[PDB]
């Protein structure tokens, strides 16, 4: 199955508890540190040994994180380990942020341009995107010399291409016919 199909129940349970107790910020840090720690090459190896029991894998991961996990977050790691799903931690953190972003009415937007775009232009783009998405947009600008001009915006599955590269492809498709 897709890792997203298996991490949905755990991400939803952690989000409902964090929301009901007003701990939304705390759990973003706990899940983020568990995700990062579970992917380091010595922890990645310890979480695959055949002689360790589920409780020892959970305890080892709890001791490494230490103070970056409250009592509820420790009960959650013990639950994920007992159900044999510690490989889902990076995906659980990713899905928890999606639920939190839609709760706070915010959207993460990726932007690529031919040349560096100034703060005035970034805010001008953000204003329009916020109006159509009816969400607080957070832009992540980046450079791509492949484009000969313009910008390409992407927010989830929505893709708006204003780059002259895309315009040159449309011109080609209309003349090759």
């Amino acid at each position: 199955a897709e890792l997203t199909t298996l991490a949905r129940p755990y991400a939803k349970a952690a989000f409902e508890y964090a929301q009901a107790h007003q701990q939304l910020a705390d759990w973003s840090a706990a899940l983020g540190v568990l995700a990062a720690v579970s992917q380091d090459d010595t922890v990645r190896q310890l979480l695959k040994e055949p002689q360790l029991t589920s409780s020892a894998k959970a305890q080892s991961l709890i001791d490494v994180c230490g103070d970056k996990l409250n009592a509820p977050a420790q009960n959650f790691v013990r639950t994920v380990a007992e159900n044999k799903r510690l490989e889902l931690l990076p995906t659980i953190a990713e899905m928890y942020e999606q639920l939190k972003a839609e709760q706070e009415k915010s959207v993460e937007v990726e932007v690529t341009s031919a040349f560096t775009l100034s703060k005035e232009q970034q805010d001008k783009l953000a204003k329009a995107l916020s109006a159509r998405l009816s969400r607080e947009v957070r832009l992540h600008a980046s450079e791509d010399a492949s484009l000969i001009g313009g910008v390409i915006i992407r927010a989830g599955d929505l893709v708006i291409d204003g780059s002259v590269r895309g315009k040159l492809a449309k011109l080609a498709e209309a003349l090759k016919s």
Partner: protein, 74 residues
């Protein structure tokens, strides 16, 4: 990656975040998780025997037939 087992439900997982303790629910009781074609999957019911009678809300009765690790198919 194994498919999502019948007890890997957001409510069951959230219940364990608040309290890991299994004894917080009597071994004599459980909760319906799924209802398909005459088959009900229950979470809990730890002291059930093979063939034992289950009382459901309303006067309906069922019988345990699959005593699995996380659920009981009746």
């Amino acid at each position: 990656m194994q498919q999502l087992n019948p007890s890997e439900i957001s409510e069951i997982i959230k219940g364990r975040i608040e309290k890991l303790d299994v004894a917080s629910q009597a071994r004599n009781e459980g909760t319906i998780v799924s209802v398909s074609d005459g088959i009900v999957r229950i979470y809990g019911l730890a002291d059930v025997m093979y063939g034992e009678m289950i009382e459901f809300p309303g006067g309906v009765y069922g019988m345990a037939l699959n005593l699995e690790q996380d659920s009981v198919g009746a």
